[PDB]
Amino acid sequence: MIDFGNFYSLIAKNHLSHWLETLPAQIANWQREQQLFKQWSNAVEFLPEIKPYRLDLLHSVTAESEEPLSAGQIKRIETLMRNLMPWRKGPFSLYGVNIDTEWRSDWKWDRVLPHLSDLTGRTILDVGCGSGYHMWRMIGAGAHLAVGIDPTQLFLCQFEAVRKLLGNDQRAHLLPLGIEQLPALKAFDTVFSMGVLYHRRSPLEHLWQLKDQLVNEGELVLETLVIDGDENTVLVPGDRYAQMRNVYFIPSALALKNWLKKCGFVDIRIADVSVTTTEEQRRTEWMVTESLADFLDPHDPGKTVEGYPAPKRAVLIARKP
Numbered sequence: 391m392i393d394f395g396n397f398y399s400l401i402a403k404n405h406l407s408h409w410l411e412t413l414p415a416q417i418a419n420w421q422r423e424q425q426l427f428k429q430w431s432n433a434v435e436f437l438p439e440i441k442p443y444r445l446d447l448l449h450s451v452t453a454e455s456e457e458p459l460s461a462g463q464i465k466r467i468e469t470l471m472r473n474l475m476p477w478r479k480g481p482f483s484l485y486g487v488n489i490d491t492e493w494r495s496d497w498k499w500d501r502v503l504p505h506l507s508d509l510t511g512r513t514i515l516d517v518g519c520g521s522g523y524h525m526w527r528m529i530g531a532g533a534h535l536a537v538g539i540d541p542t543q544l545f546l547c548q549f550e551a552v553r554k555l556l557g558n559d560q561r562a563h564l565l566p567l568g569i570e571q572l573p574a575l576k577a578f579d580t581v582f583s584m585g586v587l588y589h590r591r592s593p594l595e596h597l598w599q600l601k602d603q604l605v606n607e608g609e610l611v612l613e614t615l616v617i618d619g620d621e622n623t624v625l626v627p628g629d630r631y632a633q634m635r636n637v638y639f640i641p642s643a644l645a646l647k648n649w650l651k652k653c654g655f656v657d658i659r660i661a662d663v664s665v666t667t668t669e670e671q672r673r674t675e676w677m678v679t680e681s682l683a684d685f686l687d688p689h690d691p692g693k694t695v696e697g698y699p700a701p702k703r704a705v706l707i708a709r710k711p
C-alpha cells in the first residue's frame with residue numbers, strides 16, 4: 391500500500407485540520423476495496439529515492455543529478471516508469487527519462503498561468519489532478535501546498551513515482567478521493583477544476599462544491615470542454631463524445647459564465663478558449679492506445695467521429711465573495 395500518514399500529520403498542523411474528521415475513513419475504505427495493481431505498486435516501491443541536485447518546477451518538471459547517472463540506472467528507472475503507462479498528463483523529465491505524455495499539459499498551464507492571482511504562498515486544491523503534473527507547476531509558481539484529488543489507482547501510483555524521484559517532496563499530495571466525497575472545507579486559497587465539469591451529472595452542484603472548498607475571496611479556476619454560442623447554447627451528447635463515455639454538459643463559455651453567476655461566483659472572466667489540436671493530445675511512446683486523431687471525423691477535424699463539434703476548451707476564472 392501507500393501510507394497517508396505524512397499527509398495527515400501535515401494537515402493536523404495547518405488550516406486543513408478539520409479534514410481529519412472524514413479523510414482517513416474515506417481513504418481507509420478506498421484502500422479496502424482495492425484488492426494490474428501489484429505491477430503499479432512495485433513500480434513505485436522499486437524506483438530509487440533520489441534527491442534531485444537540480445529541480446525546475448517553474449518552467450517544466452525537470453530533475454537532474456549533479457553527476458549524470460549510469461546508462462543502466464536510467465534504464466531501470468525508464469522501465470519501471472514504463473510499467474505505469476498510460477502516461478497522459480505531463481510531460482516529466484527525470485534524470486534523463488523523458489516522459490512524453492499524451493497531453494502537453496504544459497500548454498494548458500501556459501494558457502492558465504497569466505490569468506491567475508499570484509500563487510505564491512497559497513494553499514491549493516486541484517480537483518481531478520491526474521498524474522499531478524500541474525501540482526508540481528503550482529509548487530514552481532511558489533504555492534505553499536498543493537493538494538490534489540483523483541480516485542484512480544494508476545494516477546496515485548504515477549504521482550508517487552514522481553514524488554519519490556523528486557526526493558520525496560512533501561509540498562504536494564494526491565488523495566484518491568472523488569470530488570463528491572469532500573465536505574465544505576472552505577479552506578483553499580485557489581481551486582482548480584480542469585477537465586472535470588463535463589464528467590459530472592450535476593454541473594451546477596459541481597460549481598457549488600468547488601465554491602465550498604474556497605475561503606472568502608478565494609479564486610476558482612475552471613477549465614472544461616465547451617461549444618461556440620450565446621448564453622443559451624449547451625450541448626448534451628449521447629453515449630459518446632470524442633469516444634468518451636459519461637460526458638454530460640458542454641456549454642458555451644458564455645453559458646458557463648452565467649452558471650457561475652447562478653452559483654454565486656463573482657468577477658467572472660472568460661480567459662482562454664482554444665480548439666484542442668492533435669499536437670496538444672496524441673499517442674506517444676508513453677501512451678500507446680487511441681487518442682484525439684482517432685476521435686475526430688477523418689474527413690473534417692472540426693467534428694468528432696460521432697458528428698459533434700470538436701473538442702474546444704475554455705478557462706474561466708472567478709472569485710468567491
Ligand SMILES: Nc1ncnc2c1ncn2[C@@H]1O[C@H](C[S@+](CC[C@H]([NH3+])C(=O)[O-])CC(=O)[O-])[C@@H](O)[C@H]1O
Binds near residue numbers: 540
Ligand atoms: N469523481 C471525481 N472527482 C475528481 N476527479 C475525478 C472524478 N472522477 C474522475 N475524475 C478525474 O478527472 C480527471 C479528468 S482529466 C483532466 C486532468 C487535469 N485536471 C487536466 O486538466 O489535464 C481528462 C481531460 O479533460 O483531459 C481524470 O484524471 C479523472 O480520473
